[PDB]
Design a protein around this nucleic acid. Structure first.
Lengths: 148, 193, 99
RNA sequence: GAAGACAUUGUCAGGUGGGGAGUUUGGCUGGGGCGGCACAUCUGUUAAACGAUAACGCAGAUGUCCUAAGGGGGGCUCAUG
RNA sequence: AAAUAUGUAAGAAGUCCUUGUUACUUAAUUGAACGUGGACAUUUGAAUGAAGAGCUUUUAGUGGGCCAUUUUUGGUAAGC
RNA sequence: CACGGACCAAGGAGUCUAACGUCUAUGCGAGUGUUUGGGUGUAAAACCCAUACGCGUAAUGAAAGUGAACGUAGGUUGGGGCCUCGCAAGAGGUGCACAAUCGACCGAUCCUGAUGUCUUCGGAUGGAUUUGAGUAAGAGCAUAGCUGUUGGGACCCGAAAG
RNA sequence: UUGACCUCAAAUCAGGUAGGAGUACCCGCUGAACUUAAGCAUAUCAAUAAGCGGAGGAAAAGAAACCAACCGGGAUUGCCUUAGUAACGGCGAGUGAAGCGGCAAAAGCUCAAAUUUGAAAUCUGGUACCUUCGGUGCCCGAGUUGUAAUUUGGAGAGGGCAACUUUGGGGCCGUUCCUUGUCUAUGUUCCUUGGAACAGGACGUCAUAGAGGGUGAGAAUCCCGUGUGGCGAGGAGUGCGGUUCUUUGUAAAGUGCCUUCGAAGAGUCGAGUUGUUUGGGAAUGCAGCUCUAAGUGGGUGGUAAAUUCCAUCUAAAGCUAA
């Protein structure tokens, strides 16, 4: 998918657009990441601050599955209900008929409070939650049933 | 070699990689060979359905334990409860695994029921003959799927008691954190003359 | 170990009706016998002690068991192996050498 | 015959080891080498009355010293004749 | 103590009058800062111009320089 | 009075890849990506597809860990466009995007440290010349293209060496 | 003196086997430097090239001394991903896996350690015969310094009680596979050009066949073929289906309850040191030397150590397709 390349246009011109003085050479400043502390330093500082050095603790044999904890916000919480039942449950805003939501089956670990669900009772089954999420749910009329 | 604002790339090509490039032009051909092998196997073998009946199994870690999965085999206990022996099961199309154990009655009963369904829905040819033709199926897995068990219904009442789930979690965490200190403190306080 | 039903704490996870599987016959591997006891007793009788075991019974008679465990940890590898070897030596000493 | 639990052999450890191996052996520079540092800094001047401004330009300095030679207050007024 | 060169300003984000907020400030509802409300407009606050003004992204080549007038250092001087 | 070039023919030099950036086009859009694989086939094409997985939708902190609405999702200044009056010029209202600014929210840091208490735990509430690659009604995913980047024989030829 | 045993020899003893080639792919050993780091020694190149030994149609690996920390999975291999990640690193250049998950493909087992002891029940060889890729008899021998049956950890064995179930080898014929032969449609009609019609034009035919090639120029219809079906031949194999002859069997296997037992691999594991290697970090693996275990033990649980617990496997012997 090539022939709209500038080589096709530089045909005829001597240097192929790399210059007569500089004279395109092989690796005139180094290979790869050479000189990060010596002659490419002003690039690394300013555009890569933090590149050199260690910081924190090591973890030998980290498994990310231990740290699987994907988050759901309350604004997106009502999407775990299918659209078929959603208006039914938006109406009949009641105890004794309140929808159950398994956020873990949806694929979520922690619930978080980014804002303003409607004043409808909801049962939210979650591994973890936050303070505001629990407050907002309990204020809308629901509860959080912890699970594992 | 370092230039304008761009990410640091880590491209691992400082070896003779061109000698070990593999391009899968053989993809569609290997597919064809694989289909032909399945077909040849079905025909050559039998009216037998190309695969053993595998069990339902609860997956490992917190990431995946919510799912339920197809395992390898049927835990000699489960087989004995289904009412047959391991050797006959292996002859009859059941995968057996000696090196796993039942700790959960739900999975145990699910797999036993699965075995009973299989034992009812098969017909086993005699040792002698007369070969009543049976018009085979190719997938025990497709005849016997892997269903996710549900926990609770959509709708329930609200059972609140003001326990503050967040506080609950924090107190569990604190209890685990400060268990050993307390179990040393009480121990060294019991040393009262 | 009954679980709690939550995702953190001392006991942690799903409440599940347990089933307590049968005890495998492995997990009972080094749980010796009558025969092995007999054979090992008789072979100890025949062969006897080795040089560092002589050193250890001497060090237990003279310089106590702390230095004995030290010596046995240098001679063997582990502190637990040293412990068990010193106890073997004490069962040798206190049982036969008294009467 | 001699010798003898020593030598030898094996593994560690120390010393020696250009015999040999591998590598390195600065820059500025009225060519380079010798010389010097103009290679990190300060004052005056060059420097052309904002600022900036070179030369192995001029005249010099720095890698320290101080529990006071820092801080505050009070009183006094110095060199010289 | 020049000449040349150099900074700022030449107003609507402005000026004036009334009066609100504050944990700052004051001896003090005195100030400071920010405001409400009101008044002053088409010479709305020198000139000339404005082939548009403002803003962002990315990337090439270059990073040996040389000459002339004038100012000037070293040098006897030099196409130094 | 620097280098190559006696002449002619043919050959002859910024390519392909992996991962990427900005920009442009297209498709869907709080999602997106069928093509590892399966089914199917007028067969290495085209057609269909499950579960996963990747990126994205949540930052922050060394980590433990906590985790984004006082308020019509804030105020002020300006803002295209729209609306009302006006013959028009103008006036007033509303004001997306964007910009400047003052605030609020989440996280780290430093303080305060309540009701309660396995009496060493817990952490409210209120703050700060501190800090974040943040929130403050989502924009991304995939494919393709120019250009540019890195590694690769890496535009072509070229050492003394090892 | 005679005859044995043990160890060691020789024979052109009877019968066999190894060597070398090939070496794309595979199992190992050994092992660089160029190069990158804008210099260069660690590093990198690379656990690569070169060198050596060894195999097959695949090899290797392989049915846990595993992964984990789950509501727990469950031989091995490979793909997608994990992941340019955790980690290593003059923490510089650079390097850099694994568990989970989805898929392909799936397959499981064998020994040693047990007195058969009321009967070495086992096996090579030679010879005679035979329905001879083997069988029966007879005779020497090997072998109890342990050949068969039985058992391998998932279990299992010895006794006792109770009953119930299920069985093996051939011959033939079809089928499967492989190889191969053969048969199976239509214009060479007319005119022009041309040396030649396979061109052009007119009329037509076949088509589950207009793919290709050849023939004096671009031919479905001239030839071979192609397409579709049919008829045959010869081998491998019992992988399957119909047949026929032998019932081997007071044999073997499976299942329930009570009781007594339950052997499980050492110069090894492990440790210290050295060197090499690894992402492997107070030491990932390997090897050398030194030390050297145990049995309610041992290993592993990615920060050295002691104490207490827990979880999970069961090494130091072995086979096996895709």
């Amino acid at each position: 998918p090539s022939r709209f390349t500038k080589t096709r246009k530089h045909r005829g011109h001597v240097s192929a657009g790399k210059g007569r003085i500089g004279k395109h050479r092989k690796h005139p400043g180094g290979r790869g990441m050479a000189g990060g502390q010596h002659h490419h330093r002003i690039n690394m500082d300013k555009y890569h601050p933090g590149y050199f050095g260690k910081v924190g603790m090591r973890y030998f044999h980290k498994q990310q599955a231990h740290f699987w904890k994907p988050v759901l916000n309350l604004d997106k919480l009502w999407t775990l209900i299918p659209e078929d039942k959603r208006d039914q449950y938006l109406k009949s805003a009641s105890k004794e008929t309140a929808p159950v939501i398994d956020t873990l089956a949806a694929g979520y670990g922690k619930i978080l409070g980014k804002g303003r669900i409607p004043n409808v009772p909801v049962i939210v089954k979650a591994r973890f939650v936050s303070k505001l999420a629990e407050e907002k749910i309990r204020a809308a009329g629901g509860v959080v049933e912890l699970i594992a | 070699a370092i230039s304008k604002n761009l990410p640091i790339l880590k491209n691992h090509f400082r070896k003779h990689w061109q000698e070990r490039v593999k391009v899968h032009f053989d993809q569609a051909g290997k597919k064809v060979s694989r289909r032909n092998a399945r077909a040849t196997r079905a025909a050559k073998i039998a009216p037998r359905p190309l695969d053993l009946l595998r069990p339902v199994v609860r997956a490992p870690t917190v990431k995946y334990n919510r799912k339920v999965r197809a395992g390898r085999g049927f835990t000699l206990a489960e087989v004995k409860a289904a009412g047959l022996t391991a050797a006959y099961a292996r002859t009859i199309g059941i995968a057996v695994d000696h090196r796993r154990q039942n700790r959960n009655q739900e999975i145990f009963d699910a797999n036993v029921q699965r075995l009973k369904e299989y034992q009812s829905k098969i017909i086993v040819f005699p040792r002698n003959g007369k070969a009543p033709e049976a018009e085979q199926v190719l997938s025990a897995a497709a005849t016997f799927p892997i269903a996710q068990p549900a926990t609770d219904v959509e709708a329930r009442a609200v059972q609140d008691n003001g326990e503050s789930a967040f506080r609950t979690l924090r107190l569990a965490r604190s209890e685990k954190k400060f268990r050993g200190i307390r179990e040393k403190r009480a121990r060294e306080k019991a040393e009262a003359e | 170990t009954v679980k709690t039903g939550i995702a953190i704490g001392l006991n942690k996870g799903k409440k599940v009706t347990s089933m307590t599987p049968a005890p495998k016959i492995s997990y009972k591997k080094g749980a010796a016998s009558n025969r092995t006891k007999f054979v090992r007793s008789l072979v100890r009788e025949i062969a006897g002690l080795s040089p560092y075991e002589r050193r250890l019974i001497d060090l237990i008679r003279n310089s106590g068991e702390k230095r004995a465990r030290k010596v046995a940890k240098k001679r063997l590898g582990s502190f637990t192996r040293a412990k068990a070897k010193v106890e073997e030596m004490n069962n040798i000493i206190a049982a036969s050498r008294r009467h």
